Ligand binder design. Structure first.
Ligand SMILES: Nc1ncnc2c1ncn2[C@@H]1O[C@H](COP(=O)(O)OP(=O)(O)OP(=O)(O)O)[C@@H](O)[C@H]1O
Ligand SMILES: Nc1ncnc2c1ncn2[C@@H]1O[C@H](COP(=O)(O)OP(=O)(O)OP(=O)(O)O)[C@@H](O)[C@H]1O
Ligand SMILES: [Mg+2]
Ligand SMILES: [Mg+2]
Ligand SMILES: [Zn+2]
Lengths: 204, 190, 649, 175, 445
DNA sequence: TTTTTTT
DNA sequence: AAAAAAAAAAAAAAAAAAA
């Protein structure tokens, strides 16, 4: 018996559709560790039952065919439970890494989801480790090229930029930009992509 | 990169980039022939033409440099032999008279057309609307031929001798997945 | 031209490829020959093909049939006639019968796909194409013969002459019409006398089929289409039946394209030339292992209560009601005596009770479970319109009786809701049909008695909002005792307020509302579906697939599924006619004498007719256990059930 | 065959009819009264993920514990229905894992007569999928929706991918 | 005579093939997408027609019935040009394409139509009350003679200028010595289209003083059929023309009617059982559904001018959403609606909520309990004036199936009329047994 | 005197 | 040139009856 596991797996499918329709990593939903621990306790029951049945099989009063068929059935049940759990976990890890790869590996809690409370503690420490790896990777031979930069090919040099949020003044190379609220800039493309990804600039 | 399976095909922006990475002829307005000044000394283009240019003489530069100079007043792009009515006419006649072979046309079909129409609106000898309509006619005819040819899809291979870039790009996923499923069925049957 | 010959020979090749149809033809021929002069049934010249085999043989001919039957069916019929003629061998035939020239028209079965429609979906682009439409039978016309080919004789010449007449609806192909003028003069002035008994006449009947109202759009009325069928199958079925008809959908008539038009917005006629008809019935036969399973169930000790509990599992309590319904669905036999006239044979049951105690739901379940049933409401019916109607048929201009509601359900069951809310006038009609099960219509020059042997199940509300248990039972009911004494069994249901029963029924109801159709997720509502893949459809004893009936594990006692129960009812109502014995007589008479003189309060007074109810209940219970004789156990159970229904546990 | 694929995991969960070719005491505990054993030739509806194995183990006449009966989805009725006209068939109604189940069934039992018909079915449906994918807006008929609601789940991803490809190409072309 | 037709067709084809905004030829792309999904139709916006050229608009304004067929055949010529290869020389199952117009002219009410609008394009709006069943009309007729016995084809256009407009049968035969009209119609090998009739009633709030609403008749054909249902506000664009009445009173009478060319509806036939919204609108609906407090937004939005009442508004919203329909293996149905009764003191504005609820719900009817009867709500049995045959016509409660019904003054209705609704609301199916007609009709509201 | 029901 | 009308269903106003 492992039908309950399907209830988990089916749910995961919906989350993928959430990724599919949006086409943007955002608002990962709350976990389902309750059903997971339900499956864990039932599989502990299955394991103890299998151990007991092996005990009586070794005891001599248990039929060999009954013992073997019970063993195979229980083993298949454990196999399906494990498959369901890892099927959930792999997708969760994949979407977590996809989210972590594009935000420069800083987790950006100041400005995706706000609380990140919808993630398990193990998932959060995994996210921290992946951010560590992301920071480490660009610190080696590829220091001159930012791996977490844009992916749109550079098509034009001068674009119009309209302010979205207010700040003070920000220095650049050979100049300084004052982020007055709701103004327009005629600046170089390769200077403001960092701000645009941060959400402080609009109207590319 | 993955970003929702963007790791399997090309986005139209990448196609436009890989097309503008191509050489073209130019008709410069200014002169920078060396005093007999700053060296161009690029890393992915022969700077000799850039350094050795003089006004009102034809020379070859990569496309995006020509576009940048056209954003300024130092450029005059020379259109290819396609972009004229009397060549497109014989081309459409060739498609009409041969209902099975796609006409000979390069990979950069319709992309150079879009870019030149968007930027170099004024340097043409022909009205823009006529050329746009004829290009639209070519697009429709080739689309019809593609639909006609797609009817049969062997599980072994196929030949598409004269498809341009965008036409292949748009059709890649559907065709690939259909033949993958057919191959899976056939192999599973054996 | 020669395309007809090529198609004919190709069809001959196809017929020669398969051997089943030739076997059917020779069986028909030998049966007809055996029925000639050997010390009344005849087999019509029709054979059913399965066009799946035709598709598997030739796609071109199959496509030609299913797209343009006009140019394809007649060649097939001609080839079939030629093959039948060649196989036929009658050295010594008759004279008038040999000139029939029956062409052996065809019938079809198999998968249609996009050509199985509904009366609402039929439209312009489906014309001239073989189709198969489902629906309900609304009304039928009158059988009328029509002429095809006449025979003439002249005394001087001695040469018989024949002229053949065909109309637009007679043949699929349009030809120059011929009037019905009898030619009585030869080319040289000889007198010609029409020879009856040698001419050809075929039956004709028109019916109209209507889409089922259940599958209807949002706030739209059901619609109907016109069907013509002739020759054989001319008077099958009746109004109020679920049918599926396969035929050609064609247009006919000028429609006003001639000078006869009076307005610009005229139209054309549309009509169906039916080829074959099947009883949809939403199948009715018994297999060998089906009979084995029925027998092994019957020989069990406790089949009756299992069958009772099997009825409507979603209704809590009311076990005795379920038992009463089971006994009513398969009631006792009719009795007719050369001197004693007739005795009523089935059971009638009435329900009166406090509101919202699941009476209408059980009545709906009885509607769905029973074979033939019709639903009526007290406020939505008129007594005169319930039994018969005087309407004029359009084609003949003659007024003919139209069957009423309960006449259609003869030998079936009729369920009435809001019975006490009916107009009193209509009630008297009910009494008539409860008196001798016969309705007589004498009006506008028609004097006829119509048979109606149906049983009635009904539910009614008390006079007040709720039943008053401290009052006279007659005080609580608005119906006169004249018809209340007719009903065999009367039940009073009241929802006593007890927290234990409240919790139990709450658990049951909450269990019900958490149900999901198999193979369907819970996030989206129920959608409409397509019909079955085949327009026409049709190792033993070792599987017990649906025989045990226990679909899921919820209680130790067994359960049976609805189709098996209906099969059991069908077997029981035909294969056994039990007879009572003297021991059951002794028990019944003892119980009747005791009950007559118990002399205490009771819900209703008792009289002699209750002994008839005991007899019929014992007969029904004997039918339940499939025995040809009534034993005292059935008398005991009938007495117990009567005591529960009239005294109260 | 992918371990970490959602659709395959879901498709493994469907139930297939099967019969106990062999009689084993003490079984059926997980479905009925545990104390009563299961007698021989008993029909059951077991899930695929265990019926696939229990039909091949043998265990031991090394006959397997279970014998798997032909499922109702693969019936002559459905074969005729799919052959006569596949384009208008609502194959979604028959099952919502039809193609993967077909692949697994044909893998378990090699049958040349299913491969060709299924291949032709999907090949014919692909043309209409392409037809609808090419169409774009710029007042909507029922044909498109009633077709789209009949699809198998595995064709939906092809439809979406093609639709997005065409939409992106159109958007780039017109600016 | 033919030269003018050729010039007009050429001009329309030039307009179709030459009109472009920005970098898009809108109508050619529309034609391609329409042909792909087997919707042989095209939609013309009148403003584009005027802007491209004014003389063609003038000609379309002067004689609509004479001009429209030329355009609707130029469309099919262009479609054949840009969808089928000539292959240096087949099926050709492309009928004449349907032309549908849209415009934004000044509305003209029903009662303002007079003799000066004959054979003119007009725009108007009303309410739909009754719909006729479908019917067939011939477009390509195969005609065979009897004596000479030769075949001929007649092509029929569905536009009528004069009342007759029909060549019934050619006089004499084609070349011996046949009769007047020895021709018959070959029913096989012919082409037929579909036609339907509709009735329009005046909008309630434009009725002039002390009057009764007036009815009008409309004819629709091909794709325009089966698009509306009775009781839905619509906007129609068409031609106002007349047809003679020989079978009919007066002298030289000619009953007028409307030929539908374009229909705009408020519900867009969406509920009439699948979802067809675009991705933008569905995304917006999801975005609103994602709001954490949309319950209060909807509660406030129910009758903003009514002050103070809260639980009643919550109940009204809950009723509008409705329950969840269920079904069971044994056939038992379970109701999926909720029924609310307001039983209050005078002056508390009970009906002011009723008419607003009628306004909000997509399917709603408002009626008084005093002016109602049992036969006038569930089902009414009529009989035809001519053929006398009985038929079933639905009332009010069936007309609002799949929606909600607004009844006020529930007590004033007669006791006999208050018992017919019991089954109609407890089981949602009404049964009729009258004049031999037995029918189980469903009503979900 | 009033409302109900039948003609 | 003519099928045309008896049989039903539904909506009132008057009178008489019961409370
Ligand atoms: N024992 C029961 N088991 C299940 N449902 C029950 C039971 N008793 C009552 N109900 C529920 O009570 C509701 C009453 O519905 P329904 O109108 O059919 O009842 P009723 O007693 O026939 O009422 P009425 O006399 O008003 O027609 C139903 O929804 C039904 O499911
Ligand atoms: N809460 C309220 N806020 C504003 N206006 C109100 C409110 N209650 C009543 N009204 C006013 O009452 C007036 C009349 O109300 P209406 O006649 O619809 O009330 P009702 O309760 O339906 O009456 P009835 O029981 O007599 O049919 C309206 O003009 C409306 O403005
Ligand atoms: Mg009820
Ligand atoms: Mg009011
Ligand atoms: Zn002639």
């Amino acid at each position: 018996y492992g039908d309950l596991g399907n209830k988990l797996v089916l749910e995961a499918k919906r989350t993928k559709q959430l990724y599919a329709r949006s086409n943007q990593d955002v608002n990962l939903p709350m976990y389902h560790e309750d059903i997971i621990r339900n499956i864990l306790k039932e599989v502990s029951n299955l394991r103890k039952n299998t151990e007991y049945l092996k005990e009586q099989q070794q005891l001599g009063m248990l039929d060999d065919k009954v013992a073997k068929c019970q063993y195979f059935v229980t083993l298949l049940c454990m196999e399906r439970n494990k498959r369901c759990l890892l099927a959930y976990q792999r997708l969760r890890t994949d979407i977590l890494d996809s989210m972590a790869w594009n935000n420069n590996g800083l987790d950006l809690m100041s400005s995706s989801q706000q609380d990140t409370n919808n993630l398990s503690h193990q998932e959060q420490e995994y996210l921290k480790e992946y951010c560590d790896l992301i920071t480490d990777l660009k610190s080696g031979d590829l220091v001159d090229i930012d791996l977490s930069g844009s992916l749109v090919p550079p098509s034009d040099v001068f674009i119009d930029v309209r302010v979205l949020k207010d700040a003070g003044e920000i220095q650049t190379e050979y100049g300084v930009f004052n982020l007055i609220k709701d103004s327009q800039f005629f600046v170089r493309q390769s200077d403001v992509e960092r701000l645009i990804q941060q959400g402080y600039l609009q109207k590319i | 990169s993955l970003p929702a399976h963007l790791q399997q095909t090309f986005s139209p922006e990448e196609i436009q980039f890989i097309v503008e990475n191509e050489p073209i002829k130019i008709f410069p307005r200014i002169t920078t022939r060396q005093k007999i000044h700053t060296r161009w000394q690029l890393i992915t283009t022969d700077d000799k033409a850039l350094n050795n240019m003089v006004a009102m003489r034809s020379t070859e530069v990569v496309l995006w440099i020509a576009l940048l100079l056209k954003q300024q007043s130092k450029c005059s792009i020379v259109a290819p032999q396609w972009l004229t009515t009397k060549e497109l006419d014989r081309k459409i006649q060739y498609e009409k008279t041969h209902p099975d072979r796609f006409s000979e046309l390069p990979w950069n079909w319709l992309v150079l057309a879009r870019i030149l129409f968007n930027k170099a609106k004024d340097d043409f000898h022909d009205p823009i609307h006529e050329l746009r309509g004829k290009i639209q006619d070519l697009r429709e005819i080739r689309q019809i031929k593609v639909l006609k040819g797609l009817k049969y899809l062997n599980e072994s291979h196929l030949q598409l001798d004269n498809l341009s870039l965008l036409e292949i790009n748009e059709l890649r996923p559907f065709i690939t997945e259909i033949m993958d499923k057919l191959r899976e069925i056939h192999t599973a049957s054996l | 031209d020669a395309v007809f010959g090529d198609r004919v020979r190709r069809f001959q090749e196809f017929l020669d490829t398969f051997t089943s149809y030739r076997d059917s033809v020779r069986s028909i021929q030998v049966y007809n020959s055996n029925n000639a002069a050997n010390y009344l049934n005849i087999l019509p010249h029709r054979i059913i093909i399965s066009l799946d085999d035709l598709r598997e043989f030739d796609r071109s001919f199959w496509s030609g049939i299913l797209v343009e039957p006009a140019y394809f069916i007649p060649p097939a019929e001609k080839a079939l006639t030629d093959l039948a003629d060649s196989m036929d061998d009658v050295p010594h035939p008759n004279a008038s019968a040999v000139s029939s020239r029956h062409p052996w028209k065809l019938s079809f079965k198999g998968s249609f796909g996009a050509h199985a429609l509904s009366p609402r979906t039929l439209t312009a682009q489906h014309l001239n194409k073989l189709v198969s439409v489902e629906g309900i039978v609304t009304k039928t016309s009158l059988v009328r013969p029509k002429l095809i080919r006449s025979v003439h004789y002249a005394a001087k010449t001695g040469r018989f002459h024949y002229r053949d007449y065909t109309d637009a609806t007679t043949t699929l192909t349009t030809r120059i019409p011929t009037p019905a003028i009898y030619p009585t003069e030869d080319t040289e002035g000889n007198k010609l006398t029409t020879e009856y008994g040698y001419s050809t006449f075929i039956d004709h009947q028109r019916i109209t089929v209507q889409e089922m109202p259940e599958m209807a759009p949002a706030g739209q009325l059901p619609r109907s289409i016109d069907v013509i069928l002739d020759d054989d199958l001319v008077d099958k079925t009746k109004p109020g039946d679920r049918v599926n008809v396969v035929g050609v959908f064609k247009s006919l008539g000028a429609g006003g394209m001639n000078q006869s038009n009076s307005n610009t917005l005229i139209g054309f006629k549309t009509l169906i030339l039916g080829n074959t008809v099947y009883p949809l019935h939403a199948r009715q036969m018994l297999t060998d292992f089906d009979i084995r399973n029925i027998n092994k169930l019957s020989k069990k000790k406790d089949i009756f209560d299992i069958l009772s509990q099997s009825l409507a599992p979603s209704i809590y309590g009311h076990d005795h009601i379920k038992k009463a319904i089971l006994l009513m669905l398969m009631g006792g036999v009719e009795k007719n005596l050369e001197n004693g006239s007739h005795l009523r044979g089935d059971i009638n049951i009435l329900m009166v009770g406090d509101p919202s105690t699941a009476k209408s739901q059980l009545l709906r379940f009885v509607l769905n479970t029973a074979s033939l049933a019709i639903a009526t409401t007290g406020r939505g019916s008129s007594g005169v319109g319930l039994t018969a109607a005087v309407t004029t048929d359009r084609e003949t201009g003659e007024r003919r009786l139209e069957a009423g509601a309960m006449v259609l359900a003869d030998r079936g069951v009729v369920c009435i809701d809001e019975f006490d809310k009916m107009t009193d006038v209509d009630r008297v009609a009910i009494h008539e049909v409860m008196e001798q099960q016969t309705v007589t219509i004498a009006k506008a020059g028609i004097h006829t008695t119509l048979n109606a042997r149906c049983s009635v199940i009904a539910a009614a509300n008390p006079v007040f909002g709720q039943y008053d248990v401290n009052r006279d039972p007659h005080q609580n009911i608005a119906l006169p005792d004249s018809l209340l004494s007719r009903f065999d069994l009367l039940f009073v249901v009241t929802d006593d307020i007890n927290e234990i029963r409240d919790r139990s029924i709450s658990e049951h109801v909450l269990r019900t509302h958490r149900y999901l159709p198999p193979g369907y997720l819970e996030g989206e509502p129920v959608r409409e579906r397509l019909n079955l893949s085949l327009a026409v459809g049709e190792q033993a004893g070792a599987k017990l697939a649906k025989n045990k009936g226990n679909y899921n594990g919820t209680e130790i006692p067994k359960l049976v599924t609805i189709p098996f129960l209906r099969k059991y009812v069908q077997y029981a109502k035909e294969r056994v006619i039990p007879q009572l014995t003297q021991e059951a007589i002794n028990v019944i008479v003892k119980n009747y004498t005791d009950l007559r003189n118990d002399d205490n309060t009771k819900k209703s007074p008792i009289t002699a007719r209750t002994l008839e109810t005991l007899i019929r209940l014992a007969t029904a219970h004997a039918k339940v256990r499939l025995s040809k004789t009534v034993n005292k156990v059935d008398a005991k159970v009938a007495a117990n059930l009567l005591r529960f229904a009239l005294l109260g546990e | 065959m992918g371990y970490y694929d959602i659709d395959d995991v879901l498709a493994d969960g469907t139930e297939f009819p099967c019969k106990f070719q062999y009689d084993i005491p003490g079984l059926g505990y997980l479905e009925n009264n545990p104390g009563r054993p299961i007698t021989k030739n008993t029909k059951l509806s077991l899930p695929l993920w265990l019926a696939r194995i229990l039909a091949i183990v043998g265990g031991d006449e090394p006959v397997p514990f279970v014998e798997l009966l032909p499922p109702d989805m693969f019936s002559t009725k459905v074969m005729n229905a799919i052959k006569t006209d596949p384009v208008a068939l609502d194959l979604h109604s028959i099952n919502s894992h039809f193609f993967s189940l077909a692949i697994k069934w044909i893998m378990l039992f090699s049958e040349k007569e299913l491969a060709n018909v299924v291949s032709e079915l999907l090949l014919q449906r692909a043309q209409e999928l392409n037809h609808h994918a090419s169409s774009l807006s710029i007042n909507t008929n029922i044909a498109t929706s009633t077709f789209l609601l009949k699809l198998e789940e595995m064709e939906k991803e092809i439809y979406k991918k093609s639709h997005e490809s065409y939409k992106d190409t159109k958007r780039w072309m017109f600016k | 005579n033919d030269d003018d037709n050729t010039e007009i067709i050429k001009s329309f084809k030039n307009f179709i093939l030459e009109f472009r905004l920005d970098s898009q030829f809108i109508y050619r792309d529309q034609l391609r997408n329409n042909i792909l999904v087997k919707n042989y139709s095209l939609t013309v916006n009148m403003e584009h027609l005027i802007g491209y050229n004014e003389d063609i608009y003038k000609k379309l304004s002067d004689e609509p019935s004479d001009i429209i067929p030329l355009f609707e055949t130029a469309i099919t010529q262009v479609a054949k040009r840009i969808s089928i290869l000539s292959r240096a020389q087949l099926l050709n199952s492309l009928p004449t394409f349907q032309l549908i117009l849209n415009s934004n002219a000044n509305q003209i009410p029903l009662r303002d139509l007079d003799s000066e609008h004959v054979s003119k394009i007009v725009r108007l709006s009303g309410i739909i009350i009754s719909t006729s069943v479908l019917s067939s009309r011939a477009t390509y007729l195969s005609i065979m003679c009897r004596n000479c016995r030769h075949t001929t084809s007649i092509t029929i256009n569905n536009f009528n200028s004069i009342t007759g407009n029909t060549v019934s049968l050619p006089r004499s035969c084609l070349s011996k010595n046949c009769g007047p009209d020895p021709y018959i119609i070959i029913h096989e090998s012919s082409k037929f289209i579909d036609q339907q009739f509709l009735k329009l009633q005046e909008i309630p709030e434009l009725v002039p003083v002390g009057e009764m609403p007036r009815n009008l008749t409309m004819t629709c054909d091909r794709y325009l059929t089966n698009k509306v249902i009775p009781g839905t506000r619509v906007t129609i664009v068409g031609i106002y023309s007349i047809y003679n009445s020989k079978n009919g009173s007066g002298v030289a009478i000619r009953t007028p009617y409307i030929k539908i060319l374009g229909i705009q509806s408020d519900v867009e036939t969406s509920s009439i059982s699948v979802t067809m919204f675009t991705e933008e609108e569905e995304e917006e609906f999801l975005q609103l559904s994602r709001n954490p407090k949309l319950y209060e937004i909807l509660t406030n939005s129910i009758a903003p001018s009514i002050f103070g009442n809260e639980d009643i508004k919550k109940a009204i919203v809950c009723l509008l959403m409705g329950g969840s329909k269920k079904i069971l293996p044994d056939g038992m149905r379970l109701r999926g609606d909720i029924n609310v009764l307001l039983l209050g003191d005078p002056g508390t504005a009970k009906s002011q909520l009723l008419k607003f609820v009628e306004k909000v719900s997509p399917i709603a009817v408002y009626t008084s309990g005093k002016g109602s009867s049992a036969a006038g709500l569930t089902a009414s049995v009529q009989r035809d004036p001519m053929t006398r045959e009985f038929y079933l016509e639905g009332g009010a409660m069936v007309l609002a199936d799949g929606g909600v019904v607004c009844i006020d003054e529930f007590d004033k209705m007669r006791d006999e009329d208050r018992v017919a609704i019991h089954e109609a609301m407890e089981q949602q199916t009404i049964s009729i047994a009258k004049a031999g007609i037995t029918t189980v009709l469903n009503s979900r509201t």
